[PDB]
């Protein structure tokens, strides 16, 4: 993918996570947890909603019949109508194929970008108190209880509180 997270450095998705699109799993002394990120899940859903609002629509143009279902039309004008309609249908077929292909590419890469933006938000929060796993995880070099983990998810984690402890553990 463009942003290298989904089908990238994050090996696979979580079938277990059913309350959001993006979120966290942690392990500390006290045990394991899982929680969804609202802000980033809603960002992705709202952008997809926007596309559906734009694409699931028809023109309000009223078209009348120019081909009789039940009677023969002059052969020359019939051939012009047939040529014109088939030309219009080739254009709309092409436009439809390109629209969906293009939007599908954007939707996938957009979703990839929202995952990466969350990862980068956390990376910067943890500052010098953590290191990148390579698999989308952060090894935290201090006791991070369920209250500390909550502070990372809620964007209230203060790196300065745990800095001295963390740098000692990192340098060893």
């Amino acid at each position: 993918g463009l942003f290298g997270a989904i089908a990238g450095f994050i090996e696979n998705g979580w079938e277990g996570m059913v309350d959001g699109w993006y979120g966290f799993r942690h392990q500390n002394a006290q045990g394991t947890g899982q929680a969804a990120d609202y802000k980033s899940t809603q960002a992705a859903i709202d952008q997809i909603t926007g596309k559906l609002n734009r694409i699931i629509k028809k023109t309000n143009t009223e078209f009348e019949s120019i081909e009789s279902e039940f009677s023969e039309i002059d052969h020359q004008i019939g051939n012009v109508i047939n040529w014109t309609k088939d030309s219009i249908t080739d254009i709309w077929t092409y436009q439809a194929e390109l629209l969906v292909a293009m939007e599908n590419q954007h939707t996938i890469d957009m979703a990839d970008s929202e995952m990466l933006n969350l990862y980068e938000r956390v990376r910067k929060q943890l500052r010098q108190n953590a290191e990148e796993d390579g698999k989308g995880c952060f090894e935290i070099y201090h006791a991070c209880d369920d209250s500390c983990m909550e502070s990372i998810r809620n964007n209230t984690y203060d790196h300065s509180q745990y800095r001295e402890e963390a740098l000692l553990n990192r340098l060893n």
């Binding site: 989904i6 089908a7 994050i10 696979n12 998705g13 979580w14 079938e15 996570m17 699109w21 993006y22 979120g23 966290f24 799993r25 942690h26 500390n28 002394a29 992705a44 559906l52 694409i55 629509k57 028809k58 023109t59 009223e62 078209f63 009348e64 019949s65 009789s68 279902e69 039940f70 009677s71 039309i73 249908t89 080739d90 709309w92 077929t93 439809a96 194929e97 969906v100 292909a101 939007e103 599908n104 590419q105 939707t107 996938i108 979703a111 995952m115 969350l118 953590a130 796993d133 989308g136 995880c137 952060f138 090894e139 935290i140 070099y141 201090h142 006791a143 991070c144 990372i152 553990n169």
Partner: protein
């Protein structure tokens, strides 16, 4: 060291979509953009509609028996059916398809009496076995078959003139009877050479009843060919004829606009639609459709595509 992992959801059963680069890309969710489902019914709920059933639109101007329920009215939707009857007595209409199309764009028909009266030497109420009505022989309700009262006698050289007193244009129709044999012609209109002149400010034309052998349609080798023209407000149209004219009792006035539908599908006044085709209605919110390239109303665009799936979620990466 403690550990916090970032991740995204996945699903067991993902859906395949096409991208710019990949023909088989699995995502968590997708929705269809092309409608394949039709309702085999004409959804007429919001609509002051008119189902002509057995009646062909031209038939409502000349008044074929089958059209007796359809000589006047107002509508926003008009539904023509297959094998609908326009002519009880065999014949055709010059510019048939232009006239049919003109009626099927209309939002109703008003009728206006021409007032035409004929001398004692003319029989106005000529009838045929083909145009049955009340179980007895009859004729087109909006026209009169003008014949001599004394059989064989030459037809009185007569003149009838309709003036348009209205503020809007009127659609006048008349017929010319082309008999099978020189025996039938002389029998009804007399031995003399026949001429029929029609003249207005805008329109002008001459008609000669041609006589010649032809195949039987409903056991009748005779033909009544119909003609038509617009008569502008305050203008006159004059019919100079020495026999062979089928004269109008009434002219027609097409009012406003309406959606013409050609379909075999039954009506349903419970269901709403703005898009119709031969096979019925299309109620879909989807932008595209692969049911028919022949549709009428506000329609999704026809595409040469079974399915076009639009991704509504991220790449599905299972474990």
């Amino acid at each position: 060291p403690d550990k916090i992992c970032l991740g995204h959801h996945a699903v067991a059963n993902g859906t395949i979509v096409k991208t710019l680069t990949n023909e088989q890309e699995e995502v968590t969710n997708a929705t269809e953009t092309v409608e394949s489902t039709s309702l085999n019914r004409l959804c007429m709920k919001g609509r002051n509609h008119k189902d002509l059933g057995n009646c062909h639109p031209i038939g409502m101007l000349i008044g074929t028996p089958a059209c007796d329920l359809h000589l006047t009215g107002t509508w926003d939707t008009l539904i023509e059916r297959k094998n609908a009857i326009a002519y009880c007595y065999p014949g055709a209409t010059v510019n048939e398809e232009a006239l049919r199309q003109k009626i099927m764009e209309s939002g109703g028909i008003s009728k206006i009496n021409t007032g035409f009266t004929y001398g004692s030497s003319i029989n106005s109420a000529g009838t045929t076995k083909a145009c049955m009505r009340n179980g007895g022989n009859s004729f087109y309700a909006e026209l009169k078959w003008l014949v001599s009262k004394n059989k064989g006698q030459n037809f009185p050289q007569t003149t009838n003139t309709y003036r348009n007193a209205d503020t809007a244009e009127h659609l006048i129709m008349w017929g010319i009877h082309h008999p099978s044999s020189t025996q039938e012609k002389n029998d009804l209109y007399g031995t003399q050479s026949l001429s029929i002149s029609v003249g207005s400010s805008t329109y002008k034309n001459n008609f000669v009843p041609v006589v010649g052998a032809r195949p039987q349609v409903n056991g009748l080798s005779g033909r009544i060919d119909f003609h038509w023209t617009l008569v502008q407000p305050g203008d006159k149209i004059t019919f100079s004829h020495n026999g062979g004219l089928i004269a109008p009792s009434r002219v027609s006035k097409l009012i406003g606009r309406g959606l013409g539908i050609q379909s075999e599908a039954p009506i349903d006044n419970s269901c709403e639609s703005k898009c119709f085709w031969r096979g019925g209605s299309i109620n879909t919110r989807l932008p595209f459709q692969n049911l028919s390239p022949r549709t009428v109303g506000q329609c999704p665009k026809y595409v040469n595509k079974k399915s076009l799936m639009l991704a509504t979620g991220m790449r599905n990466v299972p474990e």
